[PDB]
Amino acid sequence: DISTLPRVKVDLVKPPFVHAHDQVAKTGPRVVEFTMTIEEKKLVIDREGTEIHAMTFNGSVPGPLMVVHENDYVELRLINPDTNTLLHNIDFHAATGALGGGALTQVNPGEETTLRFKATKPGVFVYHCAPEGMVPWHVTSGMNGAIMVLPRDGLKDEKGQPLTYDKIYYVGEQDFYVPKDEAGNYKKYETPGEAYEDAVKAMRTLTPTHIVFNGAVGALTGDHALTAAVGERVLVVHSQANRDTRPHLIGGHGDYVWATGKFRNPPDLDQETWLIPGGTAGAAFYTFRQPGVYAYVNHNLIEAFELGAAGHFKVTGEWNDDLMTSVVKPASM
Amino acid sequence: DISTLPRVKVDLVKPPFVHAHDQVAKTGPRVVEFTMTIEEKKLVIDREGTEIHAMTFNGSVPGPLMVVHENDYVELRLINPDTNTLLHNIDFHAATGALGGGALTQVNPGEETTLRFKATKPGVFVYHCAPEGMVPWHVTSGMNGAIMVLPRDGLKDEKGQPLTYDKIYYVGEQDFYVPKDEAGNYKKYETPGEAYEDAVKAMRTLTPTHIVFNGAVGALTGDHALTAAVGERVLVVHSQANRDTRPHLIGGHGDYVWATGKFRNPPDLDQETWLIPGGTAGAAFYTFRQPGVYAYVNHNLIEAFELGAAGHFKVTGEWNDDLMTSVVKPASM
Amino acid sequence: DISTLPRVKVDLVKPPFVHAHDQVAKTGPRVVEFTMTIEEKKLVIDREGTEIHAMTFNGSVPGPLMVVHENDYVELRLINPDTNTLLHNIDFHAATGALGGGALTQVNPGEETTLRFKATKPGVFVYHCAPEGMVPWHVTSGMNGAIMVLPRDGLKDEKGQPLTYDKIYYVGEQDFYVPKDEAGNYKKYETPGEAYEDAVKAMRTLTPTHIVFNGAVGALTGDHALTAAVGERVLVVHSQANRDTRPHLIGGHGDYVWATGKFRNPPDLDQETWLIPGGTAGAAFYTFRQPGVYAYVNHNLIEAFELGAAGHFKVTGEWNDDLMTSVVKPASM
C-alpha cells in the first residue's frame, strides 16, 4: 500500500554532478519524488559557434542523473511550460509498461503530468523523450538522460564483496546531426519546427556532425575538467541513447566495468576499453593511482578528437615511479 | 554409425514463427532432415513501393529458423530450381569444416545437393549464402537465416536452473543497400544480374538505405504484430548476418539475454539493450508483466524509426498499477 | 628495487608472427627490454596500386606484438630517426599514468627516449602513437600494435583449468581513410605533411576506404596464409585501435574467446562471431578439427570482401566425415 510508505523529495543537479544519495540503503522502500521541467533552447555546441535548438530535461544535455534504490517507487512530475513549442513525453528504460511511460506522459506546451513506477531492476538505465512519429529527432536534439537504481546493499565486485565509490560522475554522450549547405557549412534556424525537415535528412545519413560530452565540444575540459585524487575510488556513469560508444580512460583502466550497466551481473575486470551499445547506460569503477591529466574518450579516435567526444580528469597526488617512469628523457641520438 | 540412428523429417514454417520442437530432448541423437528451396524474387520493401530482387531460402527474408538439439545431425537438402539465375550455396556458422558447408553446397540453377553436419555446439547461429566473389551481395539481398541448437536438457538460467519458454519468435534483421540516382530516388532493375554493378557501389558506402525486420518496413506491425499474454515466457531469437544491431523491447527488458547467442555461457540479466554483432544470432528471454503494445527496435533510433527496424508486440491481460501508474494525467498547469 | 631484478633483451618479429616466449612463467619478475624504431614509409595497400604514407613502429602495420608476464617491467627504447619528418610518441593501454606513456615519449626526428612501466594487469592491450592534436591521423596511418601480458601461470578456461596454445598469431586490423578526387579516385602525395589537410577531411566522413589485415588487401592470403594442423591449439590475437570489428573464422568457431581481451575474466565459449571494440585487443583460442582452407574475416561482409578485411588459414590433416560430409554432391535434378 503506497499510501503508507515514506516519501522524499529530491532536487536534481546539473551533470556531470550527481545529487546526494546513499550507496547502501539506510531506509526501507520509499517513494522518491522528482520534478523535471522541459526546456527547448538554443545551444552552442562547438568553438566555431554552431547553434542548435536543443530539447532538454531541466535545461541540460544530458538531462540529470536520478538515483534511487531497487524497489523504490519513482514519482516524476514532468512539466512542459507554455514557452515551449512541441509535444514531449518520457520513456524510462528502467520501467515496465506503457512504452516505459511514454504512452502516459504526453504533454503539450502548458501541460504537466505525474508518473509513478517501481524500480524493480538494479542498474543504470537511459531515459529519453519518445513522441510518436518524432522519436529520433527528440533524442538526437539532446532529450535523454539516465537513472541509476542501486541494489539495496550497494555495489559489489565479481566475488560478491562491497565496492564503495568516493566520487561519482555522469557523462552523457550525444550524437548530433546538424544540417549542412552544399559547401558543408552548418545551417541555423529561428525555431525547432523550422529545422524539422532538414533534420530528418541529416539523420538519414547515419553520420553525426558532432559527438559531445555534456552538450558541447570541450565541455569537460579546462576548468570544467573532472577532478579526483590518487587513492580515490571513482564511479563514471556513461549513457548513449542512440549510438554505440567505446569509452576509454587514457592512462587508466576500468577496474570494474558493467558495460551494459546491469548490476545483478558480475563486472568485467581490467578493461582498457568497453562497448556501451546505443540505447544503454554503463558504469565503470576506477581507483586512481597516478596524478596528472587523464583524457576520457570515445575510442573511435576520429569521434573523440575530431568530432568532440573527449573530456579530462585532473588528478592530484604523488607520482609513483614503480608504475611508470621515464628512464631516459627524449633527447638527441 | 549414422546408418543406425533414428531420422525425422521436419517441415519449416515462415518467420517469425518457428517449427514445432521439444525444448528438453525426449529422444537420443537423431538425424534431422530439412529441405530448403532457393527462390530469387521481386520484393517490395517499403510503403513508397521500393522493389528489390531478393535472394531467399524458402521464399522468405529471413530464411526459416531450424531447431535441433546438441549432437543431432542436420541433413539439409538444398534445391536451386532452374527458374533461378544465380549460383548459390549455404554456410552454417553452427558447422565445422569446409567454410561451414559453403565449399560443398555450390548449386547452379537446376541443381540440388544434400549436406550433413553434426551440431556439436549449442546456441543460436546464423546461416547464409556465401558464393565465392559474391558473398556480401547474396547476404544483403536477404539470403540468410538462423539455426538453433538447444542443449539436450533445454535452457538454463545463470544458476543452472531450467528456463522454459511458452512462445518463441524469430526476428531476422536485414540491412539493404538499394542503389540510387543522382537526386536520391531508388533504382529498379529487370533482373538480379542487371543490378550487380550498382549494388557493389551502393554496398561500399557502408550506409544502408533500409534496415527491416522480416523483410519489409512495418512487416511485424498491425495484424502481423507478435502476440503474447501477461505471464507468458517468450524467447525472441534475433539474427543479423552483416551488421551490428542493438535490440530493445520498449516497455520491457531482456530478463535473460545471450547476446552472442551461445548457451554454454550464462545469460546476462536485466538488459535494457544488448549488442548482437554482425554475423551473429542472439536470444532474449522475457516474462511479460504488463498488457498493451510494445515496440521491439534496433535502438539506433534512426535505424528503427527512419529506416524500418521496428516491430510490435500486442500483449493481453490485466494492468498492474504497482509496476506503473499515471498519478496525474496530462493536464493544464 | 628494480636495480636487482634480472633483465632480458627481446628482439621483435614481424606480424603475424610473435616472438618466442614462455606461456607459464619460469622465472620471477624481470625487466623485459624492447627496442622499436619508428619508420615513416610509402605503403601500397591494394591490388590497384593505391599508395599511402604509413607511419610505423618497426616497419610494419601493425607494429609487432610484445609479450611479457604480469608484474614484469617493460622497458621500451623508442627511436625516431632523423630520416622521419614528424613528432611521434607511444601510448600503451597496458600502462598506468601519463596518458599511457604518451606524455613522456615525445620524440622529434633525431631523438630517442626510454620508458619503463609495470605490467600490472593481464590481458592483450593496444599500444599506439598519440601526439597532441594529431592522434587519429597517426593511428589511422598504421601507428598501432599490441602487447600481451600473460598471467604468470598462463591461460585458463572458464573452470580455472590450463589452456595451452601450440601456435599464436597476431592480426592487426587497420581502417584507412585515403583521400579521393571528385570522381572517386585515390590521391597520391609526395610527403605525409602534404597529405594532412585532405586526411582530416577524409577521416571526418567516418567511412574507411580500406580495412585490411597486416597492412594490405590480401596480405594474409596465398603464400602468406596462416598455417596449422588438425589437432593444434591456436591463439589468435586481434587488435583494432580505432574502430569496432567482429571477427569470425569461416568453418570454425572461437572455442574460448576474450573479446575485450582481459584474462582475469572467464572466456566466452563457442562463439561464432565476437565484437572487439575500437581501441581494444581481443584473443580467441581454437582447436582445429578439419583440414582445408578457412577464411578469417571481419563479419561485416562488405568490410571483409569489398574493403579488404579477410585472411586465410591453410590447415593440414584428415577430413572427419562425422563432423561434416557431402551426402549427395551438387548435381542435376
Ligand SMILES: O=N[O-]
Ligand atoms: O589511449 N587512448 O587513445
Ligand SMILES: O=N[O-]
Ligand atoms: O525506449 N525505446 O526507445
Ligand SMILES: O=N[O-]
Ligand atoms: O560464414 N562467414 O561469413
Ligand SMILES: [Cu+2]
Ligand atoms: Cu521531446
Ligand SMILES: [Cu+2]
Ligand atoms: Cu529507448
Ligand SMILES: [Cu+2]
Ligand atoms: Cu545466394
Ligand SMILES: [Cu+2]
Ligand atoms: Cu558467415
Ligand SMILES: [Cu+2]
Ligand atoms: Cu606517430
Ligand SMILES: [Cu+2]
Ligand atoms: Cu588509446
